[PDB]
Amino acid sequence: MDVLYSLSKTLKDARDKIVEGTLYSNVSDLIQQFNQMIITMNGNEFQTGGIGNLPIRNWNFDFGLLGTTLLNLDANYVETARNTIDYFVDFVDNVCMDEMVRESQRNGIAPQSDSLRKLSGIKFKRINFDNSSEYIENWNLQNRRQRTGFTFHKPNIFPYSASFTLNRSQPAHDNLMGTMWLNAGSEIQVAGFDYSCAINAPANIQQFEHIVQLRRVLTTATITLLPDAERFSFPRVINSADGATTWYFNPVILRPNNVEVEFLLNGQIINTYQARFGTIIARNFDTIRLSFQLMRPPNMTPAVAALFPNAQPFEHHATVGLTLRIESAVCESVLADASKTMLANVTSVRQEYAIPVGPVFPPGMNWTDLITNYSPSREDNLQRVFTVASIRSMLV
Amino acid sequence: MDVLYSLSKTLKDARDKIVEGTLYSNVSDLIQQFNQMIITMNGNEFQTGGIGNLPIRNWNFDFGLLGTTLLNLDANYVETARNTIDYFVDFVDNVCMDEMVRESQRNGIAPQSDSLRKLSGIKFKRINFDNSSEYIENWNLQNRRQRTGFTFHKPNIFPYSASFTLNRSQPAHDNLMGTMWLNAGSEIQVAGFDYSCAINAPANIQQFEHIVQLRRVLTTATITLLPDAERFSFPRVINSADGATTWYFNPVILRPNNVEVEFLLNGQIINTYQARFGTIIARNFDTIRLSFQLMRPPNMTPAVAALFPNAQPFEHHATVGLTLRIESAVCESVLADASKTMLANVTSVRQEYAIPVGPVFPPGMNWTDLITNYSPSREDNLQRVFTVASIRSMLV
Amino acid sequence: MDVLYSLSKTLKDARDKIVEGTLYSNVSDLIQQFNQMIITMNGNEFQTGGIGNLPIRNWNFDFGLLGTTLLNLDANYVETARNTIDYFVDFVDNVCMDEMVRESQRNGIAPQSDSLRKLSGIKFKRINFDNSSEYIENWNLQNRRQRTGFTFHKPNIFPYSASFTLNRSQPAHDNLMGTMWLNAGSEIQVAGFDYSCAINAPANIQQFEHIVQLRRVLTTATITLLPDAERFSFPRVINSADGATTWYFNPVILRPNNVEVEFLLNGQIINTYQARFGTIIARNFDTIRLSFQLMRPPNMTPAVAALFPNAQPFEHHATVGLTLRIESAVCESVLADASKTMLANVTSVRQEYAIPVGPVFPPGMNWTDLITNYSPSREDNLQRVFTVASIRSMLV
Amino acid sequence: MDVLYSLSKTLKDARDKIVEGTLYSNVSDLIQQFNQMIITMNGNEFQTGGIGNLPIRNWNFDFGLLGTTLLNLDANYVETARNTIDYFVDFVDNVCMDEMVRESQRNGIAPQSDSLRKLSGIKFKRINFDNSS
Amino acid sequence: PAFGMQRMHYRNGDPQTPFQIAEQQIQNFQVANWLHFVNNNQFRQVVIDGVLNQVLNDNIRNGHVVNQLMEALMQLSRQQFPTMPVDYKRSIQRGILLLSNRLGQLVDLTRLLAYNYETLMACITMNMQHVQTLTTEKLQLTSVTSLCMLIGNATVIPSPQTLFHYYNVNVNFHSNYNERINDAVAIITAANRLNLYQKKMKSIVEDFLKRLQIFDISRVPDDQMYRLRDRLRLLPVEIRRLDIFN
Numbered sequence A, B, C: 001m002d003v004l005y006s007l008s009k010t011l012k013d014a015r016d017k018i019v020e021g022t023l024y025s026n027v028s029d030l031i032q033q034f035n036q037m038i039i040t041m042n043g044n045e046f047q048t049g050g051i052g053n054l055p056i057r058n059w060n061f062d063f064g065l066l067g068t069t070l071l072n073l074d075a076n077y078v079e080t081a082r083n084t085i086d087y088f089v090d091f092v093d094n095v096c097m098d099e100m101v102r103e104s105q106r107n108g109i110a111p112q113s114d115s116l117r118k119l120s121g122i123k124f125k126r127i128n129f130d131n132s133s134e135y136i137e138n139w140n141l142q143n144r145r146q147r148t149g150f151t152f153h154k155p156n157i158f159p160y161s162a163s164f165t166l167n168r169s170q171p172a173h174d175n176l177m178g179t180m181w182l183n184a185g186s187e188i189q190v191a192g193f194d195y196s197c198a199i200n201a202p203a204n205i206q207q208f209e210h211i212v213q214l215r216r217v218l219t220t221a222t223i224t225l226l227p228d229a230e231r232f233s234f235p236r237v238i239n240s241a242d243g244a245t246t247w248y249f250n251p252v253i254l255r256p257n258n259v260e261v262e263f264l265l266n267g268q269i270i271n272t273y274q275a276r277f278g279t280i281i282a283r284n285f286d287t288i289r290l291s292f293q294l295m296r297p298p299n300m301t302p303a304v305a306a307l308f309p310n311a312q313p314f315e316h317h318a319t320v321g322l323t324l325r326i327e328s329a330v331c332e333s334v335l336a337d338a339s340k341t342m343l344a345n346v347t348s349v350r351q352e353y354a355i356p357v358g359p360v361f362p363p364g365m366n367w368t369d370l371i372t373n374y375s376p377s378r379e380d381n382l383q384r385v386f387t388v389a390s391i392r393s394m395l396v
Numbered sequence D: 001m002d003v004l005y006s007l008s009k010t011l012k013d014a015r016d017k018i019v020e021g022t023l024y025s026n027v028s029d030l031i032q033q034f035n036q037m038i039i040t041m042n043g044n045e046f047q048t049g050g051i052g053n054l055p056i057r058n059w060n061f062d063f064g065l066l067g068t069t070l071l072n073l074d075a076n077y078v079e080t081a082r083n084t085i086d087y088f089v090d091f092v093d094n095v096c097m098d099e100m101v102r103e104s105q106r107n108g109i110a111p112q113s114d115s116l117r118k119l120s121g122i123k124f125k126r127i128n129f130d131n132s133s
Numbered sequence E: 001p002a003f004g005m006q007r008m009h010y011r012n013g014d015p016q017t018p019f020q021i022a023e024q025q026i027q028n029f030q031v032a033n034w035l036h037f038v039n040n041n042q043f044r045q046v047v048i049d050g051v052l053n054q055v056l057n058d059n060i061r062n063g064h065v066v067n068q069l070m071e072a073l074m075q076l077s078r079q080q081f082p083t084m085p086v087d088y089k090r091s092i093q094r095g096i097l098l099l100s101n102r103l104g105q106l107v108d109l110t111r112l113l114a115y116n117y118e119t120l121m122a123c124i125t126m127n128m129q130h131v132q133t134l135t136t137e138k139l140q141l142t143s144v145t146s147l148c149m150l151i152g153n154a155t156v157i158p159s160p161q162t163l164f165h166y167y168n169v170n171v172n173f174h175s176n177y178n179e180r181i182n183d184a185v186a187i188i189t190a191a192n193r194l195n196l197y198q199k200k201m202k203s204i205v206e207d208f209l210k211r212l213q214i215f216d217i218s219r220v221p222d223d224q225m226y227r228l229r230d231r232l233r234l235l236p237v238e239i240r241r242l243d244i245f246n
Ligand SMILES: [Zn+2]
Pocket: A166, A169, A173, A239, A240, A241, A247
């Protein structure tokens, strides 16, 4: 992995720094590293691609080196370097694609392709140089078992889940009390609804709770908390819990009462925010517990009083909502996010070459299933393929 | 940990090999390693702390080397070696005890005692030699991020739970359909009972399902599956789900029908066994799904027909069972098993010196609580303490 | 097999002993053995796989020797050794997997995979060194035709069979005399039942006998014998012998009378135990004969006399039992047991790679089928695969 | 701040670039900067304070220079560098945490913790190098 | 012998040199890395100001690779030489240390040699074509030992007048070469276009070689003379001479 990353980094630096007219002192170390890469790869035979529609490709290296005494690079030097750079970039891209389409249950962190396995040999270690990318840094630290985390903008930590729970219900679904939520990406929209508007509830308060268990621990997370759930604020016709019938929801939004957000780790209260909206910080947590309340307005104007009678029928249904958005976070494991393209790259490579479904990942590289059952083996394979995808994106 | 294990291993080898009359060629390498340990430890001051009732102990090393002059070891040589080995064994045992009684939520895998933290310095790396124990092997593999394996005979993977679920029930508890199970250690005994004997079932079949989620992934597991659950095959008086009353259970055991034992990983079917009993193999799984059926006997002799009427009262209640014992398995994480004494050693050390409850483990070293909430922090601390316990058991 | 085991043992020793900071005197002989392995394996091409889903893998060996002079091992030495050991361990694991999935009716003890056949050549005999494991030791002894002994904790010697015999029966199944048994793993539960409680039997005694013929001779066996069979002591609805109908069993447990456990070899009584319960020793036997009597109590209290009338109907059926558990034993043939993982390892390797059913073992390596027809060819193939599985377990 | 940032940057560069097998030409200037940092920090005593529950920590620097004279970095070099880098990274993280938890109404742009105030002396200015963040 | 390895049975004509085999067969990092460099330290080709130049690895120019050499041979000084007689082993190790302890002098010597080579190569005007010549310059390894063991720290670089003289001689030789090529081509083309079929181009080629001033024409193989004639025939005539001929 480090050798493949070093190949990609050397090729990127050759594209960027080996330019016409540049001082040789601007590229001396880069030229030395490039010549080391040529020397190491020369005389070695590689084979990539025997899975899905990824065609078999054979790679031989018999390239020449680059000069070392000129004072400024010229067009001849760049032309000499460009063909080698193109061939090496093609080889690296094919190796990355070969490794991205492979998985195993036993050792998903170890290389799977033949080319990357050969590059794991000691002789290729000479190609290794600056490992400065976030993913390669995390790879190296994690191999040593050091505390290292990936930073995500809008981490995709919540598997898709649009569900409801009815604490009070009956066949006609005209007097319901419960919660409906959407868990999607970095977003939780929860809405507790009472059809009776807590007319008979103790102290005219109805309590709603929503617990979301994250499959991985998020640290140093910035959260935007708002007191309404726009998703559950308009009339809806919703299937029954068994799909036998459809019920009606006609929300009227009351502000949530006694809003408490508890970010917990291993069942311990790490962060607690009461009646706080806007930006909050959850430093370390694996569970989010949102507790809110619908309180009857003790004083109602004639229209508000008309909305909520003393008894059935309840035509307007009181609703309180909360919206939670993880703007950024840090996780020790790799996750899909709105800023990176690692999941997109891996999925694209697997789809373009019709890779048969393996024994680790769900078919089609579905992220909802992947994060629903994010096992250690799945974490290993995902980290491997994501690191390879970042390496490839360095050039492609 | 490697240095502490090497100290213990050197001391064990000295105890086993430095015996009266033995050829020096039988101990030459052992004597060299022992003298290397003496040189490395000399001039160093160690302290084992006073956590709990553990006495604060100070250790000074000013020992001379073991001789190399005797063709065969005599009594005087053995006595001098015994003196030095006794001091070193006392030191190592105290260090192991001081490490076992400590835990950390942040870095539970790292050393917690100051003596072991000092032994983790580079100057002590010379002491390190052969690491052939399973626990130290797994420690070193884990440090390098390699596939770890602990082999357990009768692993204690299931937290204790004797519970029941009533799918059909009523206040008088005379027409009950449900399941009662015991999950304890490596054993599961589940029993589905129908009081009506599936008289009104869609096809005279009552389906029972039991899902047991393992807190860790088990691999290469030998499992004995037997039809009957002897634990739920005799009359019982059982508390109600809320403890408000007690109900009567009067099982009559019928052969389980359409037995399907599924061993699932990430929700996917890894192993399936239909109507198979005896020894089976589950190669890799984290969940067990036992599906069975109470099938009304289509033909009944007069007594059997007498047992099961067409309506209430139901005096005899049809019960189908299943017993699932995990004889042996392999887990990437440490676990308590019927063979090893790591949990017993750690618990005994903690109870002897009245160690206050820490922030990681349950307040008795209780295994049910530990395995119920087997968090990564708990796993790290448990691996550390179990490795130290094995190191101590080499000597004590 | 000895060469493959020696490769695995050398690699295990290299992993355990070649560690940073260790004295070179702790590894000198190991380093020489490792260098001999490298020399012998150099310049040889191997191929593994090509069966089932096991991938084809080619192995070429061109490695240098470890000739660096040091007092204590450093990081450079450990890294070089690690690279070589990683390649060799991968090769050995693949060879073991290839050999574990193959079988032959003729010469099933001989190597089946091409890699092991090539490793059986004379030129590789130099790799051979210490053969200390139980399975390789037994392999070598058997090749020499000296007695080989496999020690088993809870040997899996009894194929699963939950059966019954009705010595007296009628279509109504209301006056039955017979025996029902479960012979599973190392456990034999037997229960002789008389519905009439021997009211009309001579001397008011009914005699039951249970003969269990072991497929292989067991020696130095520790047996726990308990008076009662808990498995056959609760109300039960049992299918008819031909499945036409179902009958009812309502045990009342009387202690067995005149209990004689005979352990027989070639039909000759080797061991006899009369009215002895607890721990007993069967030194050499191939058959177990459990003879026990249901004796009608000469004196009964009014509650007891109420259960056993002079004539039908018989509502309570007098049952005597016996439980026989083989805790430990020694067999000249390999067997599955509760402590080892060789059967599990072979089954897992065959299931993971979808090995087609062969001409020797039953589908899925079902242990009940294998031990029910434990033919000499099956025994040879099973010993081969179990030895290979242990060799692999040393590394994987 | 510039000295603390330069310490962190040097350590990050050392962790990223000092890897087994790499050409010394890839790290020559990095090794020079690392040795300059070691020379400047050697013999100095630092203390990260006990504000709140942050533990009081004492830091002593007595480290040998990173070696030259290798064409490609080997495992011994990387191991020694990793030991030194681990200690320095722990020190820098503790200093950053100690500075992050303090504040003053006036002169709040100036360093608050004792460690960073010490690092703001002239003698540590030698550690300062590329400020690109 | 240092690493206790069986002596190499090297086969002549092997595409790998002995050091290339040793690099793979030796596990020690110091010696293996030095062997790798020695294997891959061939000249690099670069065109400067239109002149092809054979340039050295940057590690030779700065002399840093000598450290690696030192590293490698320092390891050789610590080796056991398992079966070697101990006095001969001591002598070999002490010679290895004799070379090792001159690390600074050898780095200085390498830098001086590389700098002198670059400075004098700046004065070369014809392409530095690398060809395995028929005869060689015999270099005594005892002279190499003398240079290694006797070099001090007195930097000696080419004098500016020496550089100018070298450049002038190279320019004069190159210009004379081109002018005599032009004369030969012009005369050959004129003879062909004048239909002088009895003219012998051999005499023209001999005069051309004689005017090159560095050839004893009596020892030029005939096949090479005729190849020279053909190649001269294929060239186009210089503009001034061609206009005069027209
Ligand atoms: Zn509903």
